[PDB]
Amino acid sequence: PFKRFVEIGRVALINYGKDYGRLVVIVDVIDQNRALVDAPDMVRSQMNFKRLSLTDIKIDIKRIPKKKTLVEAMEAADVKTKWENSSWGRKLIVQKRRAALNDFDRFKLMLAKIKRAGVVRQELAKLKKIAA
Amino acid sequence: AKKTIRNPELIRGVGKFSRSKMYHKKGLWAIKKKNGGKLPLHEKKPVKPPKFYPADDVKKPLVNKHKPKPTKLRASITPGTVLIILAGRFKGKRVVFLKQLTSGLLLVTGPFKLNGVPLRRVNQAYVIGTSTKVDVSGVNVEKIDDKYFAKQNVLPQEKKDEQKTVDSALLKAIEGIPELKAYLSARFSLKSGMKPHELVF
Amino acid sequence: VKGRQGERIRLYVRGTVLGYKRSKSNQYPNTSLIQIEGVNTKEEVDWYLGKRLGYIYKAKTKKNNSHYRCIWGKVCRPHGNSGVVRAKFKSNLPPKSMGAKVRVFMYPSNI
Amino acid sequence: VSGSGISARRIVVDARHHMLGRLSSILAKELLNGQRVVVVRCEEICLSGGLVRQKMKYLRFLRKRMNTKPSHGPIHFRAPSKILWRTIRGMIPHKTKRGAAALARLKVYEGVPPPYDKIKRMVIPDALKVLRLQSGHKYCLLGKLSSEVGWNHYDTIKELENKRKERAQVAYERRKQLAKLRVKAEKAAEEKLGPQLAVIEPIKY
Amino acid sequence: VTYKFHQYQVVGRALPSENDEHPKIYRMKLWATNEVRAKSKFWYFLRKLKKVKKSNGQMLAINEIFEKYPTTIKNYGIWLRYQSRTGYHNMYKEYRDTTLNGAVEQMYTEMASRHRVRHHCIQIIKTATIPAKLCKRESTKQFHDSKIKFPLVFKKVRPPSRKLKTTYKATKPNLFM
RNA sequence: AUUGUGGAAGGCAGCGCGCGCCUCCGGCGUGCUUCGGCAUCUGCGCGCUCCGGACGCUGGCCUGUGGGCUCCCCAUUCGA
Ligand SMILES: [K+]
Ligand SMILES: [K+]
Ligand SMILES: [K+]
Ligand SMILES: [Mg+2]
Ligand SMILES: [Mg+2]
Known part of the structure; x- marks a missing residue:
């Protein structure tokens, strides 16, 4: 039993190219290798499945819907909120945040991590002597 | 007399107004009237015996019309910017940028109290300008210049006091920003997996 | 804590000396091919263009009270599509340096 | 293949389910760039084409021998580790000093003998069977081939x-x-660390 | 945005003469990689079909034809004539694409693959947009399903860019459909 | 990124400031104009510049374990 299928309404992540990190909706299937994808901020276009990673999100739309119909369907299912709140979608956001930290911000994070590690190690020692 | 330039430049070497427009703005038409319908004509602006004669005629180099221009200041570097030194004995230390001297070098301070870097000149090519800014409005370095770092060993007490006067005004600003004192007291370094071309400063 | 003894600050990245500019049948020692750790594309190479390079090695005799020798160079242009670069040094690197490491400094700085 | 370019004292590679030829070419380039490599579990290397084809190929290799003096080579090693070693030798100019030094930086073992049993073992995606061989196509393990x-x-x-x-x-x-x-320790430390967790929150996965 | 093959209408005629001051005007819909090659193939057919060579002919107009709705999916039928290693043959092919330019590109790629037919050994007789209910090839029919549903059986594992490429990794790829 | 060959010329070219006034990012006179503009008035003096081929600054070192080398032996990559 497979968990994810290519179908009309499936939300996919572009995993390669310039559009990497963007979410698109499969609105129609051309052939085994290509699908017709549409997003609120892009023109409807075809792309190969080799550049798509299917997600667990799936909106309820008909084949090749209008942009207004597509937009409301995504908002009704909270596609953006679900993706960003998910662990998979949060990974992409965190990677961008880490790369965007300046020198001063990295120094602050170092101090927080160093202090966090020191306290955690002390807590473990107590859990060792007591809960041996 | 005229208070502002008549012909602003769209680009380097090209004025905004044409010759016909400039003739009106120059006022040559008005000057012609005041001089009997003619543009006034002006006039062109009007040893010891040698002790040794060289056998070979001396050769003098041809004229070069190119004149050096002042060293430019990187856009990332602004007064109060925190700089990272990349070379020398102070490599890796984070200092505060004060101003650019006439020679084109940058005037920086540790401050000396936090990291032991005094008022020093650092070449712009050997520093990285970060995004951290510390207020230096209360810092007065008008007395400092290139001659202040010129040779003519014990450091005279006069310079030590001068360091403290500039330093004191800067400590209060640094103390205002949390964790900024420790930031300026630690050297920058590259750890495993740290790619300089991806780091944001 | 480790208790390590060594350089306390590293302001350079390591680069591997791969060889010289060459064809299938000719070699041009005046140019060297250097792979910079962490640089995997031609676009990323643009940041390192002009950066100073140092090839540090040990000689048997002492000069200026040290066995270390340094040959200076710099990054000139990218090579290929995978982040390799072409480098020139004050003197052509010896073939013995193939597989050795060089220090890619962060100066002269444009940022 | 230009090379990993990483700075490491030693690289330990687990060759399980790696394609023999593609693993060999990548490692050959790593060795030529001055990288020291240790390969473990060579018996689990995979060869495309299936046992029958690979067995026939090795039997043709066994035919090759100097007629007047068989001890003068070629030498037909049977163990998986030596077969991998000889496969890499064919992708290196082993008759030059540069090539000989590159081969001297390679170590190959069947299984995972000490001390490498307690050392982290890496994989090479460009040689993995799951990525290079289509499911349903014939392949054989080098250990199975060596046994026969x-x-x-x-x-x-x-x-x-x-x-x-x-x-x-x-373990x-x-x-x-x-x-x-x-x-549990971090949860207990949560009360103590209020400001610290706030800074790490946007960065935590 | 960019297509390997472009569709052009080429219009030409024989040079006016005393016997015929208004010679017949011929038009063709030709596929080529650019205008220059479209004109050359126009004179090829006029020379061999209407006996009008370029030396005694006149080029009137050349215009590129663009897909009307490049955002929707259409079924395209292509009637073609091609040369094999032993003679000439006719075949009809169907394709699904957003533009007829893509469908023609698929046709050339397929002919090269399944028949080893080079580009210059193919003549396109006719093209048309076929409605779903009039398609003949099963490769096109199976995608005429309102409830089209299938998994991605074969995935390509790779970093988003070569910036995140490393020779060594601590664990093998984790893949699941 | 590579490079400074020349050593007689302040030339050629394009501009700026003065030689007339104003409230000065601009304004003020003829001719033409597509009404935006225009080499139509645009001369002289003194200057500037992408303008008849690189100049400037700083440091190191100078009898040293320094510098240089076409000399010698050897090693390595390529060639043979
Ligand atoms: K230059
Ligand atoms: K000297
Ligand atoms: K030699
Ligand atoms: Mg190669
Ligand atoms: Mg000269």
Whole structure:
């Protein structure tokens, strides 16, 4: 039993190219290798499945819907909120945040991590002597 | 007399107004009237015996019309910017940028109290300008210049006091920003997996 | 804590000396091919263009009270599509340096 | 293939389910760039085309021998580790000093003998079978091929590997429990660390 | 945005003469990689079909034809004539694409693959947009399903860019459909 | 990124400031104009510049374990 299928309404992540990190909706299937994808901020276009990673999100739309119909369907299912709140979608956001930290911000994070590690190690020692 | 330039430049070497427009703005038409319908004509602006004669005629180099221009200041570097030194004995230390001297070098301070870097000149090519800014409005370095770092060993007490006067005004600003004192007291370094071309400063 | 003894600050990245500019049948020692750790594309190479390079090695005799020798160079242009670069040094690197490491400094700085 | 370009004192590679030729070419380039490599579990390397084709190829290799003096080569090694070593030798200018030094930086073992049984082992995606061979196409393990051409230590490696895996499972459970004991420690430390967690929150996965 | 093959209408005629001051005007819909090659193939057919060579002919107009709705999916039928290693043959092919330019590109790629037919050994007789209910090839029919549903059986594992490429990794790829 | 060959010329070219006034990012006179503009008035003096081929600054070192080398032996990559 497979968990994810290519179908009309499936939300996919572009995993390669310039559009990497963007979410698109499969609105129609051309052939085994290509699908017709549409997003609120892009023109409807075809792309190969080799550049798509299917997600667990799936909106309820008909084949090749209008942009207004597509937009409301995504908002009704909270596609953006679900993706960003998910662990998979949060990974992409965190990677961008880490790369965007300046020198001063990295120094602050170092101090927080160093202090966090020191306290955690002390807590473990107590859990060792007591809960041996 | 005229208070502002008549012909602003769209680009380097090209004025905004044409010759016909400039003739009106120059006022040559008005000057012609005041001089009997003619543009006034002006006039062109009007040893010891040698002790040794060289056998070979001396050769003098041809004229070069190119004149050096002042060293430019990187856009990332602004007064109060925190700089990272990349070379020398102070490599890796984070200092505060004060101003650019006439020679084109940058005037920086540790401050000396936090990291032991005094008022020093650092070449712009050997520093990285970060995004951290510390207020230096209360810092007065008008007395400092290139001659202040010129040779003519014990450091005279006069310079030590001068360091403290500039330093004191800067400590209060640094103390205002949390964790900024420790930031300026630690050297920058590259750890495993740290790619300089991806780091944001 | 480790208790390590060594350089306390590293302001350079390591680069591997791969060889010289060459064809299938000719070699041009005046140019060297250097792979910079962490640089995997031609676009990323643009940041390192002009950066100073140092090839540090040990000689048997002492000069200026040290066995270390340094040959200076710099990054000139990218090579290929995978982040390799072409480098020139004050003197052509010896073939013995193939597989050795060089220090890619962060100066002269444009940022 | 230009090379990894990483700075490491030593690289330990687990060759399980790696394609022989693609693993060889990548490692050959790594060795030529001055990288020291250790390859473990060479008996689990995979060869495309299936056992029958690969067995026939090796038998053709066994035919090659100097008619007037067979001891003068070619030498037909049977063990998986030596077959991998000879495969890499064909992708290196081994008759030059540069090539000989590159080969001298390679070590190959069947199984995972000490001390490498307690050292992190990496994989090479460009040579992995799951990425290079389409499911349903023929392939054989190098250990199986070696056994049929005169390698008699397959059983010995099999028993030692089972013993190592069981010990590794015990160690894995100890770390697994130690991890459960550490999630409690951070929760207890949560009260103490109020400002620190706020800074790390946007960065935590 | 960019297509390997472009569709052009080429219009030409024989040079006016005393016997015929208004010679017949011929038009063709030709596929080529650019205008220059479209004109050359126009004179090829006029020379061999209407006996009008370029030396005694006149080029009137050349215009590129663009897909009307490049955002929707259409079924395209292509009637073609091609040369094999032993003679000439006719075949009809169907394709699904957003533009007829893509469908023609698929046709050339397929002919090269399944028949080893080079580009210059193919003549396109006719093209048309076929409605779903009039398609003949099963490769096109199976995608005429309102409830089209299938998994991605074969995935390509790779970093988003070569910036995140490393020779060594601590664990093998984790893949699941 | 590579490079400074020349050593007689302040030339050629394009501009700026003065030689007339104003409230000065601009304004003020003829001719033409597509009404935006225009080499139509645009001369002289003194200057500037992407303008008849690189100049400037700083440091190191100078009898040293320094510098240089076409000399010698050897090693390595390529060629043979
Ligand atoms: K230059
Ligand atoms: K000297
Ligand atoms: K030699
Ligand atoms: Mg290569
Ligand atoms: Mg000269």
